[PDB]
Chains A and B, each alone.
Chain A
Amino acid sequence: GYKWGMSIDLNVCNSCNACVVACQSENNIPVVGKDEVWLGREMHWIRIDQYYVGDEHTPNVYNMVMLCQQCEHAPCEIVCPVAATVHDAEGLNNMVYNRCVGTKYCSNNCPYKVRRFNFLQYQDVPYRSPIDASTENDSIPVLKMMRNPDVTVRARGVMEKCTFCVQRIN
């Protein structure tokens, strides 16, 4: 059934980063502060990778836009203790944000390190520093409308990944 697959053409990926925001506008991906991006905790299910091959004065630069490959033999699934991230009969790794107890092992088994983890309460982060907890359950009422009404707004301690936009497949 439906064997959901994707075919990226890196010949034409000019790193416009429009796919990085399109996954944010669609999947309710939370902004992270600069203090926590320098710690390598950016929530970006899809990322473009410059690679700068040779001759550091005049290097050719190539992009491999990296997202969750939805591996059929997904190594990030055999490693979830509570069985949150499982595969699909349609053929794409299902991240279930609610069964995720935040073990965060799945990223360590993920060969591509696509899975991003809601380490702190990443929500309204430029409007509330995530290193607090007095307001981590209080949401900005104006921001609640830009969120997609069919993608889970992840709490803290819940891993996420590029789900092939199940909100559009379902």
Chain B
Amino acid sequence: SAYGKMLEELLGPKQTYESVTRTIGDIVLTPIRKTPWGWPVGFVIAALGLLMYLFSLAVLFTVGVGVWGINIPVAWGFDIINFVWWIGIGHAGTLISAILLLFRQDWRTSINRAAEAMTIFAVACAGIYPLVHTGRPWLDYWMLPYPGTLGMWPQFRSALEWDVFAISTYATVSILFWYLGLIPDLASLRDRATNIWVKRFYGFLALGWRGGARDWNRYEVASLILAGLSTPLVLSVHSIISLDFAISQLPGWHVTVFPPYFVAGAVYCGFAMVILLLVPLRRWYKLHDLITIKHFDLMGKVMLASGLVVAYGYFAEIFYAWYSANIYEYFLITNRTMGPYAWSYWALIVLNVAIPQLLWFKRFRVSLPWLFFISICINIGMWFERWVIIVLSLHRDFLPSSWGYYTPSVWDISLYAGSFGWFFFLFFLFIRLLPAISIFEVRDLVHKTETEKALA
């Protein structure tokens, strides 16, 4: 049937419930020192990247926030370009896990946890920059509302006060919706462990899951509503992060279309990171029977449906800069196209509007070497968008006597390139400790493929 021809393109040749469990119950529950190579010599490169993270933080806390090369015109440099970037990555991990659950689509089941757990670790590296770019990080509890023996409360008019309410909600909701999606799987890992103190570990995480006829109905409504709550959440988290630029009167920042273009940029850069992390998980970890090439064909289309709202945002920011008869937004066009950071706006149009237009053609989407090259070109390209928006619009603004440059210091590089350590330290821990791909959601779409094969 026409419905079976799209289900059979997401799974391998033949799969049963104990086969989809064994395929994921062998990437986990394999013994330590039987764990595959490339993980420990990938977890060490990730741990050495974490020692660069905790040392670029210990140098930042001790010496100051001014080891970053941030000037006074451009006080927001890599610390916020990488905050909006890292949180932008995490938004298309929930568009897979939560927004696609609204559309009841099934190409999300295999890429569910490898993107939902990708969100959290892209928030654990994005939730640190608003806690560390402050000059006095120890007083970051002042951005929280609490009766604190001095009548001051946070402002609730600035988007850095909505950030600590978006990032903290995005954290403790994409964690709970991720931990919700694990209690059935951690019950599969517990029942299949055959190792005391390993069965107890997953038996403690999967609280009492039990399966259950009614426990599954309460799950299907808790997972649907959480998916229906993480759809306006991530539509607002990178819209609130969008508003720490759009509530400022700066020329390149007060662009009103930032909310539906930062969200479109977060889904754009996020699917690039999902593809960058699944082509290795599909190749190295033998998950060819679960993460089929139709998942990348569709991720390349959703990464295209978002990349055209970004490539539209580059025009709704150029046109309405010109359409605004301001001297200061006319200059915005003649400061990005020309100017000292002209190459930033041209290593951006090339990397978001020229190179990733190949996602239109199935020749450049099914072919994973191109989808992996376009995803590299988007993650770098969507970093330059966050550099064009922040630094290229700050360093040349009103009052020409306040024009800086922001050459980033070594402690911006040794913190951003070390942030990938804290991302892969957790992402390699998640692969080894937890199922790197949903089990019951892949038990379904196997029960759904046999249910459709039953009629035909």
Contacts and interface: CB of A to CB of B under 8 A. Distances in A.
Nearest to B253: A108
A103 B206 CA distance: 40
A81 B168 CA distance: 15
Nearest to B139: A101
Given A79-B248, A82-B142, A82-B155, A130 B134 contact: no
B72 A79 contact: no
Contact of A108 (B137, B163, B250, B405): B250
Interface in B377-401: 394, 397-401
A113 B136 contact: no
A105 B249 contact: no
A119 B248 contact: no
A100 B136 contact: yes
B250 A101 contact: no
A75 B66 contact: no
A101 B134 contact: yes
Given A49-B401, A100-B136, A113-B399, A119 B142 contact: no
Contacts of B137: 101-102
B450 interface: no
Interface in A54-94: 64, 66, 75, 78-83
A44 to B, nearest CB: 10
B398 A78 contact: no
B244 A117 contact: no
Contact of A117 (B135, B140, B152, B155): B135
A121 B152 CA distance: 26
Contacts of A24: none
Contacts of A66: 399, 401
B87 interface: no
B157 A78 contact: yes
Nearest to A104: B75
A116 B73 CA distance: 9
B175 interface: no
B135 A158 contact: yes
Interface of B: 62-67, 69-73, 75-76, 133-137, 139-140, 142-143, 152-155, 157-161, 163-164, 244, 247-250, 253, 394, 397-402, 404-405
In order of increasing CB-CB distance, the 6 nearest A-B pairs are A102-B135, A157-B135, A119-B66, A40-B71, A113-B402, A120-B64
26 contacts: A40-B71, A78-B158, A78-B247, A79-B157, A79-B160, A80-B158, A81-B154, A81-B155, A81-B158, A82-B142, A83-B152, A102-B135, A103-B160, A104-B65, A104-B133, A105-B158, A109-B250, A111-B398, A112-B399, A112-B402, A113-B402, A117-B75, A117-B135, A156-B64, A156-B65, A158-B135
